[PDB]
Design an enzyme around this catalytic site. Structure first.
Site, mmCIF file in Angstrom:
data_model
loop_
_atom_site.group_PDB
_atom_site.id
_atom_site.type_symbol
_atom_site.label_atom_id
_atom_site.label_comp_id
_atom_site.label_asym_id
_atom_site.label_seq_id
_atom_site.Cartn_x
_atom_site.Cartn_y
_atom_site.Cartn_z
ATOM 1 N N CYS A 41 0.818 -1.207 0.000
ATOM 2 C CA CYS A 41 0.000 0.000 0.000
ATOM 3 C C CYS A 41 0.853 1.258 0.000
ATOM 4 C CB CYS A 41 -0.988 0.045 1.173
ATOM 5 S SG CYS A 41 -2.320 -1.130 0.901
ATOM 6 N N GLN A 42 2.025 1.191 0.602
ATOM 7 C CA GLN A 42 2.858 2.409 0.680
ATOM 8 C C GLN A 42 3.320 2.724 -0.734
ATOM 9 O OE1 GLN A 42 6.145 3.415 0.200
ATOM 10 N NE2 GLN A 42 5.914 5.424 1.180
ATOM 11 N N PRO A 90 8.625 -5.878 -4.491
ATOM 12 C CA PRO A 90 9.489 -4.761 -5.013
ATOM 13 C C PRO A 90 10.557 -4.196 -4.057
ATOM 14 C CG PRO A 90 7.178 -4.363 -5.440
ATOM 15 C CD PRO A 90 7.182 -5.568 -4.589
ATOM 16 N N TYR A 91 10.388 -4.418 -2.787
ATOM 17 C CA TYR A 91 11.269 -3.856 -1.742
ATOM 18 C C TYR A 91 12.075 -4.886 -1.036
ATOM 19 C CZ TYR A 91 8.433 0.383 -2.529
ATOM 20 O OH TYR A 91 7.814 1.450 -3.195
ATOM 21 N N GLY A 92 13.078 -4.417 -0.300
ATOM 22 C CA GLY A 92 13.822 -5.268 0.634
ATOM 23 C C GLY A 92 12.891 -5.713 1.766
ATOM 24 N N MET A 131 8.959 -4.313 3.940
ATOM 25 C CA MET A 131 7.870 -3.370 4.235
ATOM 26 C C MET A 131 7.462 -3.589 5.677
ATOM 27 S SD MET A 131 6.179 -0.773 3.340
ATOM 28 C CE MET A 131 5.106 -0.031 4.565
ATOM 29 N N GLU A 132 7.464 -2.495 6.426
ATOM 30 C CA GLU A 132 7.246 -2.520 7.828
ATOM 31 C C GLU A 132 5.795 -2.661 8.283
ATOM 32 O OE1 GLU A 132 8.523 0.143 6.010
ATOM 33 O OE2 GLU A 132 7.596 1.981 6.630
ATOM 34 N N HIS A 140 16.272 -2.810 10.119
ATOM 35 C CA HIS A 140 15.561 -1.638 9.592
ATOM 36 C C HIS A 140 14.085 -1.770 9.826
ATOM 37 C CE1 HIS A 140 15.151 1.710 6.655
ATOM 38 N NE2 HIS A 140 13.991 1.123 6.448
ATOM 39 N N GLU A 141 13.514 -2.904 9.373
ATOM 40 C CA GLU A 141 12.101 -3.022 9.543
ATOM 41 C C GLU A 141 11.592 -3.083 10.971
ATOM 42 O OE1 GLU A 141 10.427 -2.585 6.835
ATOM 43 O OE2 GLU A 141 12.111 -2.746 5.509
ATOM 44 N N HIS A 175 11.310 0.502 12.261
ATOM 45 C CA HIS A 175 10.100 1.202 11.891
ATOM 46 C C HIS A 175 8.924 1.031 12.824
ATOM 47 C CE1 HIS A 175 10.646 3.126 7.990
ATOM 48 N NE2 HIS A 175 11.053 2.019 7.392
ATOM 49 N N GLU A 192 12.307 7.553 7.222
ATOM 50 C CA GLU A 192 13.405 6.721 6.754
ATOM 51 C C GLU A 192 14.759 7.021 7.299
ATOM 52 O OE1 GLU A 192 12.807 4.007 5.627
ATOM 53 O OE2 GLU A 192 10.783 4.414 4.934
ATOM 54 N N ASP A 249 5.900 6.814 -6.395
ATOM 55 C CA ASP A 249 6.721 5.685 -6.848
ATOM 56 C C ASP A 249 7.832 6.085 -7.737
ATOM 57 O OD1 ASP A 249 5.230 3.644 -5.422
ATOM 58 O OD2 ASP A 249 3.901 3.291 -7.089
ATOM 59 N N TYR A 264 16.705 8.146 2.744
ATOM 60 C CA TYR A 264 17.397 7.181 3.622
ATOM 61 C C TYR A 264 18.738 7.687 4.032
ATOM 62 C CZ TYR A 264 13.771 3.892 2.203
ATOM 63 O OH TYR A 264 12.571 3.271 2.012
ATOM 64 N N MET A 324 13.309 -3.931 -6.646
ATOM 65 C CA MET A 324 13.547 -2.798 -7.554
ATOM 66 C C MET A 324 15.019 -2.336 -7.514
ATOM 67 S SD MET A 324 10.108 -0.567 -7.354
ATOM 68 C CE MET A 324 10.251 -0.257 -5.653
ATOM 69 N N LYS A 325 15.671 -2.457 -6.355
ATOM 70 C CA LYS A 325 17.052 -2.089 -6.188
ATOM 71 C C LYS A 325 18.010 -2.869 -7.052
ATOM 72 C CE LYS A 325 20.319 -2.400 -2.510
ATOM 73 N NZ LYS A 325 20.660 -2.613 -1.112
HETATM 74 N N1 1V6 Z 1 14.677 12.683 -2.457
HETATM 75 C C1 1V6 Z 1 13.716 12.546 -1.578
HETATM 76 N N2 1V6 Z 1 12.662 11.770 -1.912
HETATM 77 C C2 1V6 Z 1 11.703 11.648 -0.995
HETATM 78 C C3 1V6 Z 1 10.605 10.891 -1.237
HETATM 79 C C4 1V6 Z 1 10.632 9.765 -2.067
HETATM 80 C C5 1V6 Z 1 9.461 8.968 -2.257
HETATM 81 C C6 1V6 Z 1 8.286 9.294 -1.623
HETATM 82 C C7 1V6 Z 1 7.099 8.564 -1.798
HETATM 83 C C8 1V6 Z 1 7.197 7.176 -1.529
HETATM 84 C C9 1V6 Z 1 7.522 6.732 -0.278
HETATM 85 C C10 1V6 Z 1 7.650 5.361 -0.046
HETATM 86 C C11 1V6 Z 1 7.454 4.397 -1.051
HETATM 87 C C12 1V6 Z 1 7.146 4.836 -2.300
HETATM 88 C C13 1V6 Z 1 7.025 6.204 -2.524
HETATM 89 C C14 1V6 Z 1 8.270 10.440 -0.870
HETATM 90 C C15 1V6 Z 1 9.403 11.211 -0.628
HETATM 91 C C16 1V6 Z 1 11.985 12.243 0.183
HETATM 92 S S1 1V6 Z 1 13.675 13.147 0.081
HETATM 93 O O1 28T Z 2 12.164 1.703 3.915
HETATM 94 C C1 28T Z 2 11.521 0.748 3.501
HETATM 95 C C2 28T Z 2 12.360 -0.469 3.053
HETATM 96 C C3 28T Z 2 13.624 0.036 2.335
HETATM 97 C C4 28T Z 2 13.862 -0.645 1.003
HETATM 98 O O2 28T Z 2 13.161 -1.585 0.585
HETATM 99 N N1 28T Z 2 14.949 -0.233 0.310
HETATM 100 C C5 28T Z 2 15.877 0.912 0.539
HETATM 101 C C6 28T Z 2 16.399 1.357 -0.772
HETATM 102 C C7 28T Z 2 16.460 0.041 -1.597
HETATM 103 C C8 28T Z 2 15.287 -0.849 -1.046
HETATM 104 C C9 28T Z 2 15.749 -2.215 -0.906
HETATM 105 O O3 28T Z 2 16.355 -2.529 0.136
HETATM 106 O O4 28T Z 2 15.476 -3.048 -1.795
HETATM 107 C C10 28T Z 2 10.030 0.856 3.139
HETATM 108 C C11 28T Z 2 9.639 1.344 1.694
HETATM 109 C C12 28T Z 2 8.243 1.823 1.838
HETATM 110 C C13 28T Z 2 8.307 2.479 3.165
HETATM 111 N N2 28T Z 2 9.305 1.784 4.039
HETATM 112 ZN ZN ZN Z 3 12.287 2.099 5.756
#
Ligand code: 1V6
Ligand code: 28T
Ligand code: ZN
Ligand code: YB
Ligand code: YB
EC number: 3.3.2.6
Length: 608
Positions: A133-134, A264-266, A268-269, A293-294, A297, A316, A373, A381, A562-563
């Site tokens: 959802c985030q 898509p992420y490492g 999600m908290e 990390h998680e 959060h 973050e 996105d 971060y 995605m990373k």
């Molecule tokens: N370069 C910077 N980018 C941000 C930022 C980046 C992304 C978001 C939205 C968002 C946050 C978490 C997951 C997907 C999308 C909000 C803020 C904050 S400082």
């Molecule tokens: O901060 C996190 C997890 C961080 C995360 O998945 N990361 C950090 C940058 C690269 C990516 C990853 O580890 O694949 C979530 C994203 C939505 C909100 N919190």
């Molecule tokens: Zn995070």
């Protein structure tokens, strides 16, 4: 303060206090069908209508006080979706509450959801669903005030095919046969702590569990359970340290769910149930910082929350700060500094990638007309971490700064805040060091693009060997290649090997004979650690080794974090020998990718 990513009535007009969700998951239609009952409290006198967020939702009816009410869907506003206006049957006074029951169905193309066929799963016999959802995808599952400025509790009952299991970001509250259909089961959930709606999460699949600590079960398909349990065995130890740093863990359970490779992420908290990538499964616990990390959060983000997505760095940066303290307590201060300096490296790479003037390199962003996105990156971060680590050093060190952090978490627990709220509290807490605080270039740090105006101080102890070996390879000429040997790596940890590769990738390309010699002596092709392999394969592709093409295409497509996926595809598109294969592979896999990742890789490749 305006939430420019939401179309809903703001918190100054009305606030959702509770959600009671009743829904059914239909794998044939790829739809969630149900009723969302919102308990909404008016914040104004004479309230007679309100507006909710939706995205690609089918609305059947809206019922209040047992009768259908009028509502209208506005025209779609691209990635923000369509505002839904609801006409209340009776005007509300301030603080009055009503329950609005909305019957809805999701779209198969819901931006929140990935639907997986049996062949896409480990076990090959059952389908699978998960949510993400985030930031602003809750609205693509149910109508809501889809803004982190509003926090609510929730209860849910979810009907699934009885061979499957549902889990949510909530405490499990039992399972029964579906009394209206005996091929189905109803799984119940309760979330008693208020949360922003981005933290709502759902998974449905053939899931099993294993206990790994006193408040933690790991969940995955059977095939991954054993490996997961070992990989994340530090979890309870990390929770104890995090409670020391942040105060009590208020959420009950801390379970982990290891998703399919397309997550898509490492991590999600999601509260009570962190979601993680199976790319963490290295076999040696080496990627467990993602767990730290998680865990973190549970304080920074889930208790104290950014009021809008423009202040995402609050969520973050502080979580990275806590993450690195956890890993520091476990493995030592020199390791904390090693990870901190690596993160500055990452920040350099982000800023180089975006360019030093790009508005997405600011710490506080303006997301007016920007899809969150698309804005997403490591900037919040690592620039956020860098600010806090600078501040730590300016104000008398980690012990002192950790006192601030705990106080900050206590102050703003259960609330949603802005950067100015954070800065005001920083000045208040540190009232005896205002003169030091007034030396900070706050305008540059918070609001200017590029690298920050001052670099913190970093211990180099564990970094030095990495740099030295990287510089040996970079300065080596042909006649030097014979000198390299597998013994060069004997005293490097896996984290050091990753950093050797990161240092060398920063100087890429290297000569193709150098890269061939590196495989000959170190056999990096054999390493399955995802971070190490990602870097090695980037190195190989940027250095134009054709042998690496199928290896990189494989890693890009067999997982979806995605990373890793985004830069592998971009590197493969930039290498002429792999350019057409990269585009074609993307086209062939697109329909079966996660919808966010698919959108982003298509943007990256200029495809569609
Ligand atoms: N370069 C910077 N980018 C941000 C930022 C980046 C992304 C978001 C939205 C968002 C946050 C978490 C997951 C997907 C999308 C909000 C803020 C904050 S400082
Ligand atoms: O901060 C996190 C997890 C961080 C995360 O998945 N990361 C950090 C940058 C690269 C990516 C990853 O580890 O694949 C979530 C994203 C939505 C909100 N919190
Ligand atoms: Zn995070
Ligand atoms: Yb009134
Ligand atoms: Yb030489």
């Amino acid at each position: 303060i305006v939430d420019t990513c939401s179309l809903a009535s703001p918190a100054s007009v009305c606030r959702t206090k509770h959600l009671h969700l009743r829904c059914s998951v239909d794998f044939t239609r790829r739809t969630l069908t149900g009723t969302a009952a919102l308990t909404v409290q008016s914040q104004e006198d004479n309230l007679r209508s309100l507006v909710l967020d939706t995205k690609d939702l089918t609305i059947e009816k809206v019922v209040i006080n047992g009768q259908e009410v009028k509502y209208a869907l506005g025209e779609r506003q691209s990635y923000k979706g369509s505002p839904m206006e609801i006409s209340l049957p009776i005007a509300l006074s301030k603080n009055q509450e009503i329950v609005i029951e909305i019957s809805f169905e999701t779209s198969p193309k819901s931006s929140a959801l990935q639907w997986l066929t049996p062949e896409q799963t480990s076990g090959k016999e059952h389908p699978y669903l998960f949510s993400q959802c985030q930031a602003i995808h809750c609205r693509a599952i149910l109508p809501c005030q889809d803004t982190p400025s509003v926090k609510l509790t929730y209860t849910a009952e979810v009907s699934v095919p009885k061979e499957l299991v549902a889990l949510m970001s909530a405490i499990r509250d039992g399972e029964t046969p579906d009394p209206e259909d005996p091929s189905r089961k109803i799984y119940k959930f309760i979330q008693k702590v208020p949360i922003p709606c981005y933290l709502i999460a759902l998974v449905v699949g053939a899931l099993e569990s294993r206990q790994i600590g006193p408040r933690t079960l790991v969940w995955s398909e059977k095939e991954q359970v054993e490996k997961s349990a070992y990989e994340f065995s530090e979890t309870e130890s990390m929770l104890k340290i995090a409670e020391d740093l942040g105060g009590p863990y208020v959420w009950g359970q801390y379970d982990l769910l290891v998703l399919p490779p397309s997550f898509p992420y490492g991590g999600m908290e999601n509260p009570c149930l962190t979601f993680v990538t199976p790319t963490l499964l290295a076999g040696d616990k080496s990627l467990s910082n993602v767990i730290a990390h998680e865990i973190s959060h549970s304080w920074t983000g889930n208790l104290v929350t950014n009021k809008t997505w423009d202040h995402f760095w609050l969520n973050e940066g502080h979580t990275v700060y806590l993450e690195r303290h956890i890993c520091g307590r476990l493995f030592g201060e020199k390791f904390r500094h090693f990870n901190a300096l690596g993160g500055w490296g990452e920040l350099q790479n982000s800023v180089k990638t975006f360019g030093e003037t790009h508005p997405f390199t600011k710490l506080v962003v303006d997301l007016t007309d920007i899809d969150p996105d698309v804005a997403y990156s490591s900037v919040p971060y690592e620039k956020g971490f860098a600010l806090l680590f600078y501040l730590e050093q300016l104000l008398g060190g980690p012990e002192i700064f950790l006192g601030f952090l705990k106080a900050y978490v206590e102050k703003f627990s259960y609330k949603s805040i802005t950067t100015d709220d954070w800065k005001d509290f920083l000045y208040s807490y540190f009232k005896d060091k205002v003169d030091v605080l007034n030396q900070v270039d706050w305008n540059a740090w918070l609001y200017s693009p590029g690298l920050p105006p001052i670099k913190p101080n970093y211990d180099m102890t564990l970094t030095n060997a990495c740099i030295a070996l990287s510089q040996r390879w970079i300065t080596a000429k042909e006649d030097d290649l014979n000198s390299f040997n597998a013994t060069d790596l004997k005293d490097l940890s896996s984290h050091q090997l990753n950093e050797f590769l990161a240092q060398t990738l920063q100087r890429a390309p290297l000569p193709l004979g150098h890269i061939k010699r590196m495989q000959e002596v170190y056999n990096f092709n054999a390493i399955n650690n995802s971070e190490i392999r990602f870097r090695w394969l980037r190195l190989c592709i940027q250095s134009k080794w054709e042998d690496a093409i199928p290896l990189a295409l494989k890693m890009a497509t067999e997982q979806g974090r995605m990373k890793f996926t985004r830069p592998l595809f971009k590197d493969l598109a930039a290498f002429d020998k792999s350019h057409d294969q990269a585009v074609r592979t993307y086209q062939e896999h697109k329909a079966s990718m996660h919808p966010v990742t698919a959108m982003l890789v298509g943007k990256d490749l200029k495809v569609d």
